[PDB]
Amino acid sequence: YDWLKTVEPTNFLKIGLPYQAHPLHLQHQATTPPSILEKFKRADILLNEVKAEMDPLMLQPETEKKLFQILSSIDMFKGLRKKVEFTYNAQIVTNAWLKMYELLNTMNFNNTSQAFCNCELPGGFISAINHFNYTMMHYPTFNWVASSLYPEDHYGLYQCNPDNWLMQSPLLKKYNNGDVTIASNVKNLALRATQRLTPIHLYTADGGINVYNKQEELNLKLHFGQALTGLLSLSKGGNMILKHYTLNHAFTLSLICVFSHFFEELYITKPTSSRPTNSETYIVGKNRLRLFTPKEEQVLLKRLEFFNDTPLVDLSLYQNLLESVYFAVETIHLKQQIEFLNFGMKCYRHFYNKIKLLNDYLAPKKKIFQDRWRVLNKLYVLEKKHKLKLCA
Numbered sequence: 001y002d003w004l005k006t007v008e009p010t011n012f013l014k015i016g017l018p019y020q021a022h023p024l025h026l027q028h029q030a031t032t033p034p035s036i037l038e039k040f041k042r043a044d045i046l047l048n049e050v051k052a053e054m055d056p057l058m059l060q061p062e063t064e065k066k067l068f069q070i071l072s073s074i075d076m077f078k079g080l081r082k083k084v085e086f087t088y089n090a091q092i093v094t095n096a097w098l099k100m101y102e103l104l105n106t107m108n109f110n111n112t113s114q115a116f117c118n119c120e121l122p123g124g125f126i127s128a129i130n131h132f133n134y135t136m137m138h139y140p141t142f143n144w145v146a147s148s149l150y151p152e153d154h155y156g157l158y159q160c161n162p163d164n165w166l167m168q169s170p171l172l173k174k175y176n177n178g179d180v181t182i183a184s185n186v187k188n189l190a191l192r193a194t195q196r197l198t199p200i201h202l203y204t205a206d207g208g209i210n211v212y213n214k215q216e217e218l219n220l221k222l223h224f225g226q227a228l229t230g231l232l233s234l235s236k237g238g239n240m241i242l243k244h245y246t247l248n249h250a251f252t253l254s255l256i257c258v259f260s261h262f263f264e265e266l267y268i269t270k271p272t273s274s275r276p277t278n279s280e281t282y283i284v285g286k287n288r289l290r291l292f293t294p295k296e297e298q299v300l301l302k303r304l305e306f307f308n309d310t311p312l313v314d315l316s317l318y319q320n321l322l323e324s325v326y327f328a329v330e331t332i333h334l335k336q337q338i339e340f341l342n343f344g345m346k347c348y349r350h351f352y353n354k355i356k357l358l359n360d361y362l363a364p365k366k367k368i369f370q371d372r373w374r375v376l377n378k379l380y381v382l383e384k385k386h387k388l389k390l391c392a
């Protein structure tokens with residue numbers, strides 16, 4: 001099992017996207033797509049094919065249990081959350097906490113002080129920024145608004161902190177339930193957010209549904225409201241962190257195209273704390289250069305209002321940017337993710353009946369990787385006076 005003993009830690013994956021000097025026209029017709037879309041389409045079929053390879057295991061509950069066991073066993077960062085939570089006084093240290101924390105430590109944000117964290121429940125992202133802010137930035141006070149589809153708040157971050165969340169309980173249907181697929185909710189959330197916290201230097205949105213062959217597609221309207229909320233609230237100079245997945249659909253591509261008009265730097269990122277076997281990505285915009293015009297605002301909300309995945313811009317005008325995206329898709333999905341799904345199927349085959357053994361083989365490797373993470377994203381102990389109030 002040498003192939004096991006040689007597994008190496010992943011690297012943080014960061015792919016720069018070019019800003020578009022040119023003025024942004026939001027399309028109202030369909031345009032013939034550029035050739036390169038066939039390439040993204042070829043990536044979608046391939047990535048979907050490898051994923052399919054676990055289909056046979058998903059038919060009997062027995063093999064499906066062994067499948068998740070095997071996936072658990074290969075998760076090199078598993079007991080890191082608990083090490084982090086204890087060693088350093090951290091809170092809501094979900095896997096989301098590590099991702100946001102890793103993002104904070106890599107991206108060199110110019111500012112992380114005024115955070116609007118949307119699709120945030122429970123609140124790992126919020127906790128990560130609180131902790132990073134008070135132990136690394138030392139911002140005198142840290143102010144944040146949050147919102148999420150009202151259901152979960154396992155830790156009582158919504159219950160204890162109601163002057164910060166922007167969505168209502170059903171008992172208020174009378175009303176914004178934090179659902180970012182309703183256009184009127186996104187307008188309202190952005191307004192609320194900018195109504196009690198100015199400016200907004202950091203917007204984050206970690207939304208997703210779950211189900212894999214149409215995961216991106218199922219999530220388009222969600223990832224569009226997510227981003228509409230941000231772009232309607234993020235103040236000039238502010239920063240942005242958005243959860244995406246595959247990035248092969250022409251809408252997603254056109255959405256990234258919109259973004260490239262609004263930041264000094266734009267990147268597609270795959271943090272080591274993002275499972276290497278899933279398609280999760282984090283689009284990251286540093287230094288917002290300008291706000292929406294009043295026309296740009298209306299066109300996008302109406303598209304949210306009456307939604308179709310037709311591209312928002314003429315993709316042919318963004319050839320260079322598109323070549324950069326595919327390069328992230330080649331790096332994150334066609335290589336890394338496919339390399340790691342193959343690796344997990346291989347493990348499954350040689351260890352479906354020997355889980356304990358696989359875990360024994362990988363213990364040394366695990367400690368080294370979690371240790372590396374901690375040395376890469378230095379963590380300090382959070383002062384109890386700077387902790388978030390939790391009701392659970």
Ligand SMILES: C[S@@+](CC[C@H](N)C(=O)[O-])C[C@H]1O[C@@H](n2cnc3c(N)ncnc32)[C@H](O)[C@@H]1O
Pocket residue numbers: 094096097118119120121122123124125126148149150152178179180181206207208209222
């Ligand atoms: C992966 S969790 C994100 C939170 C992350 N675990 C954290 O604590 O940082 C999924 C999130 O997406 C949100 N979400 C999913 N669909 C949504 C929608 N249509 N509108 C608003 N939020 C949505 C959920 O409310 C939830 O907070």
